Design a protein around this ligand. Structure first.
Ligand SMILES: O=C(O)CCC(=O)C(=O)O
Ligand SMILES: [Mn+2]
Length: 267
DNA sequence: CATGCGCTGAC
DNA sequence: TGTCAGCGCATG
């Protein structure tokens, strides 16, 4: 009727250590209803009474060369972009169907889908096979086309470019991601200080200090969250997520406006 | 740079 | 016969 924290953490760390081939020191774990650590600089897990992981933070899982390489390219592409966000894969937003994102054909989407996602997906696989099996079991039940389009288990990738003193960015405003049917997987890039650009869970009073190469697995639909400002550097991050629509709404294999016309005549 | 089409939880 | 801001995406 109640899981003991000591044993569960021993198991999660054991599986993580063998899969990621690195030891996570000073790891901690807390039930979702309990008091959460105010500051997380090390491996961290939260869960419900049943023991399913609703949050997992693994520091520095990505290899240095990989993080550095993707950072230089991201910043290069983003310089030639206006908006501070981008999306690859599919989106159902504001439509009763899943559509291919506009960025996919652009330089950013091409980079994410063809180069980045295939490599990151392996680390997403490492991650889910450790902390949450139900998530990966669910993701593979989706349409074959999504996996092909985004070259990932997640149908959708969000690209967030946060420069200093930008308070207008959607990640700077406390929110839940309410269309999420599963916990998202987050990866960080760029360069910023470890006292800044942290992810704060507002209602849990918990600050996760995230750094390039770190991974964060958590439910955005349940736990309200916000990202702190940076005074220097450049904070770039990738969010792999799945909207409810991906399972429910139909898919016309085209962009938003085109998929809409097709939707009408489909009747 | 404001408006139209369109969805949806949070209130 | 509830309102509305907001991981889209244009058009002028
Ligand atoms: O950047 C982060 O750490 C969180 C971003 C996020 O929650 C989002 O993109 O909706
Ligand atoms: Mn979010």
């Amino acid at each position: 009727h109640m899981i003991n924290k000591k044993s569960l953490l021993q198991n999660l760390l054991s599986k993580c250590k063998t899969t990621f081939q690195q030891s996570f020191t000073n790891a901690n774990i807390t039930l979702k209803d309990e008091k959460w650590l105010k500051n997380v600089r090390t491996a961290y897990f939260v869960c419900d009474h049943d023991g399913s992981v609703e949050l997992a933070y693994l520091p520095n899982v990505l290899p240095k060369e990989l993080v550095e390489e993707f950072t230089e390219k991201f910043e290069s592409i983003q310089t030639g972009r206006k908006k501070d966000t981008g999306y690859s894969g599919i989106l159902d937003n504001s439509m009763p169907f899943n559509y291919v994102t506009a960025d996919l054909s652009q330089e950013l989407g091409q980079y994410l889908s063809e180069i980045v996602n295939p490599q990151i997906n392996y680390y997403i696989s490492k991650l889910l096979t450790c902390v949450s099996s139900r998530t990966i079991n669910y993701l593979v039940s989706l349409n074959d086309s999504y996996y092909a389009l985004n070259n990932c288990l997640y149908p959708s990738t969000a690209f967030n470019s946060l420069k200093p003193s930008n308070d207008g960015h959607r990640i700077r405003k406390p929110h839940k991601d309410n269309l999420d049917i599963t916990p998202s997987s987050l990866f960080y890039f760029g360069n910023f200080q470890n006292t800044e650009g942290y992810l704060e869970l507002t209602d849990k009073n918990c600050k996760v200090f995230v750094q390039p190469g770190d991974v964060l697995f958590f439910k955005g639909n349940e736990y309200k969250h916000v990202v702190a400002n940076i005074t220097s550097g450049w904070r770039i991050g990738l969010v792999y997520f799945a909207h409810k629509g991906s399972k429910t709404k139909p898919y016309y294999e085209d962009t938003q406006k085109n998929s809409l016309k097709i939707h009408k005549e489909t009747k």
